[PDB]
A paper describes a structure:
To comprehensively visualize bacterial translation, we reactivated ex vivo-derived E. coli polysomes in the PURE in vitro translation system and analyzed the actively elongating polysomes by cryo-EM. We find that 31% of 70S ribosomes assemble into disome complexes that represent eight distinct functional states including decoding and termination intermediates, and a pre-nucleophilic attack state. In the following, RNA and protein components of leading and queueing ribosomes are labeled with subscripted letters L and Q.
To achieve a detailed structural analysis of an elongating disome complex, we focused on the most populous state containing a non-rotated closed PRE state as 70SL, as well as a non-rotated closed PRE state as 70SQ. Local refinements of 70SL and 70SQ resulted in reconstructions of 3.09 Å and 3.3 Å resolution, respectively. In line with the corresponding population of total 70S (closed non-rotated PRE), 70SQ is in a post-attack state after peptide bond formation with peptidyl-tRNA in the A-site and deacylated tRNA in the P-site. Due to the obstruction of the 70SQ factor binding site, binding of the elongation factors EF-Tu and EF-G is forestalled. 70SQ are therefore locked in PRE or POST states, respectively. In contrast, bL9Q is found in the compact conformation with its CTD bound to uL2Q, bS6Q, and 23S rRNAQ H79. Interestingly, while bS1Q is present in the disome complex, bS1L is not resolved. To further investigate bS1Q in the context of the present disome complex, we low-pass filtered the 70SQ map and docked an AlphaFold224 generated model of bS1 into it. The filtered density readily accommodates the two N-terminal bS1 domains and extends further towards the putative location of bS1 domain 3. Comparing our structure with the VemP-stalled and SmrB bound E. coli disome, we find that the bS1Q NTD of the functional disome occupies the proposed binding site of the SmrB N-terminal helix.
Author numbering:
A (entry chain w): 1 to 93
B (entry chain l): 1 to 46
C (entry chain b): 2 to 272
D (entry chain p): 1 to 18
Write the structure that this text describes.
RNA sequence: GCUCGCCGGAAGACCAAGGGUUCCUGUCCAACGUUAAUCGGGGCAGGGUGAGUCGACCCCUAAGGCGAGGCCGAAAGGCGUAGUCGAUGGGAAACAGGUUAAUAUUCCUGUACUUGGUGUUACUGCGAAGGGGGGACGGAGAAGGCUAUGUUGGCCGGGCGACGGUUGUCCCGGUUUAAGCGUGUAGGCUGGUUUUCCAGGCAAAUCCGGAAAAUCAAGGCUGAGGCGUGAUGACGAGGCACUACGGUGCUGAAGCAACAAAUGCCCUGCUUCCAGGAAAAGCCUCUAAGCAUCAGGUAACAUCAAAUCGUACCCCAAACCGACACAGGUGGUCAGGUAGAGAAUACCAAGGCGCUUGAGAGAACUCGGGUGAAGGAACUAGGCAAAAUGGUGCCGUAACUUCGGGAGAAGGCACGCUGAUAUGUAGGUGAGGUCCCUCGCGGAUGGAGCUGAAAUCAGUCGAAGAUACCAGCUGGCUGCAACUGUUUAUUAAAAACACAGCACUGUGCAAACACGAAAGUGGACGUAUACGGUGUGACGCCUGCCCGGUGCCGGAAGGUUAAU
RNA sequence: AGGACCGAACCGACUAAUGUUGAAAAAUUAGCGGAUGACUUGUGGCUGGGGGUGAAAGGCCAAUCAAACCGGGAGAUAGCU
């Protein structure tokens, strides 16, 4: 949580779903895609330092990949971890 | 009517799981045979 | 007292119970409890090695002081308690220094009696003394075979042995089986008979009572098939085969003792 | 597009003793 | 969308196990769906599960598994100690409201709680791989006090009726509020407080267990529920405005009482019985060694931390186990109204569905039903089947009997509705008021108001009043087995097996015996009033004679006889 | 009080019909027996093939049992078709 090297690989991408848009408008919560092995703590430190924003709490969930077919071949989407990071009141990104 | 297979993951892993098979040499010989045959799924563990 | 129940229902018609109001009706002494898991008559290989064992009510084991080595300390019987692990009743004794223990309750024992152990104890029921110091002809019970090992003979309800003679370091005892045996004079024994002498008068009355004792049904060999038991079956009810056992050993008379190490102590076998 | 076949068979009838 | 019908102790709702995206939205109709399909649990593309207080995990153990060394075994290996694992059990803590197309005790609002770390301050005997307590435990039964919940009344809002009447004792709807905190109630359990001694609790112990003495008429522990607070809030019928049928925003009345009532709570209680009913840890306490300036303990603030994993959806089923979208199977939780003893049954509420082909026709024949003149088992291997009986109260009830039974023996009578006794009865519940209190969630009177059998008499309609559903056919002789029970999963449920009881026999405990090349284990932490084996099979009266044959037991002189 | 009575859940499976290329590789409908107990059930655990287990039917041991299943000896052997 304290190493700048660990933090720079924790955040993978922002989530741009309809739920994420509602989160921007209603509860000032940012939805991110993080490393599958990441813990709520380190994620709070990385966002606080790399975005200069105050974080209230971070809840995480694991999304199970979907099973799809490419032609006649079976395949599976990868599992990923979704983090709901709630920013302190007032601050905006 | 109650059919023969009543699934249970804990029972399934404790009976035929990788660690149950490898506990004894005879089970380890099962793994050797399945490795020689080239099985994609060595044991029943997920 | 032995009381027979009136036949208000089949299965109660023949039940005869032995009710002793003097037994403690409360809970046992907690510090003396330990687990006694059931076995089902199955050894560490998991096979049944003794048939007709299984089920029954769960029972806890009571640590009974079979050594009686608190010499010189008087003890007083607090109460008599029922013990599911044996046919006899047990007695919770309280020594004068505060130690509590469970002992077998002799015939005439009652609450408030005073017991004492040691070489200088009086010869009275409930007292434990080395058997060299007990007059010949006395009636004793819970007799130890080896010094300090603990009592092993005549421990079930109503049993006892007789000291018929003493000769040097050995005595000759008449056991309940009627055999005359030699036991080292330094062994201890408890004066008097074992209590609960009316135990043979109880009638359990129904199959469920035996199931409560952990006794499973016994199937007669003549009712089986030839593949299962030597007595086999045959059309209808046919026997025609000198009695045997599920493993071929002749029953109904054939002796099986072969020790060669303890026969030196048997001066006359039972008859 | 992945059809298959299976057959176990069972045995029973009457008597032919006369 | 409006009707109709079905389930409603389920064909509703929530889970576990198991499945694994089947969940939601858009789009498409090749294949899949036993038909068509615009639809789908189908194809495609996006989206969707958020936990200090829910589980898993973590601490703790049961059966049992593994097992350093060890013991044993040709090898492999077997068993097993210390240990270490292993829930189906024991251990800290969160509730209500709102919100998404799909998640919510996980998200927002409001209000709480728990366990650790750190710091400050004050007061300070701490401390174990030890010791004690506690945790901690059965079956059955009986009530009493409660709540969930329901009913009625009151209150609030709306209504004055598509055809007779309906401003009325009328109609419809609503009348909801948690955890937490305070109080400690009904009630249950236990005498309490000091001082003293002591070979016990592997050493010590101030603790536990003991002995004595003194003094107190009390003290302590546990525990429902209610009430207050939480809550000037939230919720709330409905309302007006906007708008994409959604919705969104604002406002918002009453929000009480009585009665009935659990299979839920007090209750892990009480009473009783024999078949005599886990463990460990957390927790409390006690001291050893090792520190007693310290450390550490207690208390109050402040503060950090509570990670990781499951979380969609199905879950008596179209998503699980059955090759099927298969009339099967599958553990737990929830338990509305009327009638009823009831979770039976019938009709309904909330809620969910009409079973993935239908449309005609109205033959034989088949299936599932309904009714039947006269007769009434003449049918038939055999009253199979069907029909008949069926409830409550009361009267009455034989041989025989082990005196319990047989017995619901048989057989019969009365059951609706209305009024009166009595504008609701006996009973139950019980406010106000009035006394008393060392004073409260108090006691005694008191009877208002609600709830309520049951009987008799009179009248009254029906062909039938236990009117439907629901719901014993009965009796006589006899064989067999005493009985309850068990059995051929899938053609046999019996007279077969078991059974209590009886007898014989073996077995002296390093027991016989059994499983094991063995160690060892079971027998049994049992000891002849015990255990194993065999046969018989409650109970009653009994079980006669034969030891030649075959076995078994005892004897040992002689004859015969192996290895050596 | 009761291996007591009656009768739901629940367990069981006696009679009959239907089903027999089934709704189904043992079911359904109307009945039927037990239903505080030798009861029933969930979750784990143990016993392994001449062995287990069996209130005993040669029953059960994964739609299989007078000796399971899988692979090997193995192309057993087959005076038979
Ligand atoms: Mg999570
Ligand atoms: Mg026996
Ligand atoms: Mg017998
Ligand atoms: Mg037979
Ligand atoms: Mg056998
Ligand atoms: Mg034989
Ligand atoms: Mg014969
Ligand atoms: Mg209906
Ligand atoms: Mg109902
Ligand atoms: Mg029903
Ligand atoms: Mg799951
Ligand atoms: Mg799919
Ligand atoms: Mg859908
Ligand atoms: Mg089609
Ligand atoms: Mg789809
Ligand atoms: Mg070893
Ligand atoms: Mg659990
Ligand atoms: Mg949160
Ligand atoms: Mg109430
Ligand atoms: Mg009109
Ligand atoms: Mg009950
Ligand atoms: Mg959910
Ligand atoms: Mg849902
Ligand atoms: Mg189905
Ligand atoms: Mg279908
Ligand atoms: Mg027709
Ligand atoms: Mg007619
Ligand atoms: Mg007609
Ligand atoms: Mg006729
Ligand atoms: Mg007629
Ligand atoms: Mg006739
Ligand atoms: Mg004829
Ligand atoms: Mg005839
Ligand atoms: Mg008939
Ligand atoms: Mg009928
Ligand atoms: Mg009937
Ligand atoms: Mg005859
Ligand atoms: Mg019978
Ligand atoms: Mg007889
Ligand atoms: Mg059985
Ligand atoms: Mg059969
Ligand atoms: Mg059966
Ligand atoms: Mg049958
Ligand atoms: Mg017999
Ligand atoms: Mg005879
Ligand atoms: Mg009964
Ligand atoms: Mg009956
Ligand atoms: Mg039926
Ligand atoms: Mg029935
Ligand atoms: Mg019955
Ligand atoms: Mg089979
Ligand atoms: Mg063979
Ligand atoms: Mg060949
Ligand atoms: Mg060969």
């Amino acid at each position: 949580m304290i190493r700048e090297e660990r933090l720079l690989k924790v955040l993978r991408a922002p989530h741009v779903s309809e739920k994420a848009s509602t989160a921007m408008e209603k509860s000032n919560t940012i939805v991110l895609k993080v490393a599958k092995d990441a813990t709520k703590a380190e994620i709070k430190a990385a966002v606080q330092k790399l975005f200069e924003v105050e974080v209230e709490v971070v809840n995480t969930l694991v999304v199970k990949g979907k099973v799809k077919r490419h032609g006649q071949r079976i395949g599976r989407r990868s599992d990923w971890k979704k983090a709901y990071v709630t920013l302190k009141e007032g601050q905006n990104l | 009517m109650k059919r023969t297979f009543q699934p249970s993951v804990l029972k399934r892993n404790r009976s035929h799981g990788f660690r149950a098979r490898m506990a004894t040499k005879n089970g380890r010989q099962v793994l050797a045979r399945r490795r020689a045959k080239g099985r994609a799924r060595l044991t029943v563990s997920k | 007292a032995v009381v027979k129940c009136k036949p208000t229902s089949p299965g109660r018609r023949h039940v005869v119970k032995v009710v002793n109001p003097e037994l403690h009706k409360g809970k046992p002494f907690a510090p003396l409890l330990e687990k006694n898991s059931k076995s089902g008559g199955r050894n560490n290989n998991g096979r049944i090695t003794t048939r007709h064992i299984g089920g029954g009510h769960k029972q806890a084991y009571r640590i009974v002081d079979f050594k009686r080595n608190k010499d010189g300390i008087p003890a007083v019987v607090e109460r008599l308690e029922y013990d599911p692990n044996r046919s006899a009743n047990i007695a919770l004794v309280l020594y004068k220094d505060g130690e509590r223990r469970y002992i077998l309750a002799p015939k005439g024992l009652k609450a408030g009696d005073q017991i004492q152990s040691g070489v200088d104890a009086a010869i009275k029921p409930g007292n434990t003394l080395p058997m060299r110091n007990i007059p010949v002809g006395s009636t004793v019970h819970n007799v130890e075979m080896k010094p300090g090992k603990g009592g092993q003979l005549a421990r079930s309800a109503g049993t006892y042995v007789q000291i018929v003679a003493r000769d040097g370091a050995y005595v000759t005892l008449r056991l309940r089986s009627g055999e005359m045996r030699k036991v080292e004079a330094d062994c201890r024994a408890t004066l008097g008979e074992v209590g609960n002498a009316e135990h043979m008068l109880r009638v359990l009355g129904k199959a469920g009572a035996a199931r409560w004792r952990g006794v499973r049904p016994t199937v007669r060999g003549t009712a089986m098939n030839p593949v299962d038991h030597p007595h086999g079956g045959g059309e209808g009810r046919n026997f025609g085969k000198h009695p045997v056992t599920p493993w071929g050993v002749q029953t109904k008379g054939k002796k099986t003792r072969s020790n060669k190490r303890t026969d030196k102590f048997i001066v006359r076998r039972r008859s | 597009x992945x059809x298959x076949x299976x057959x176990x068979x069972x045995x029973x009838x009457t008597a032919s003793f006369v």
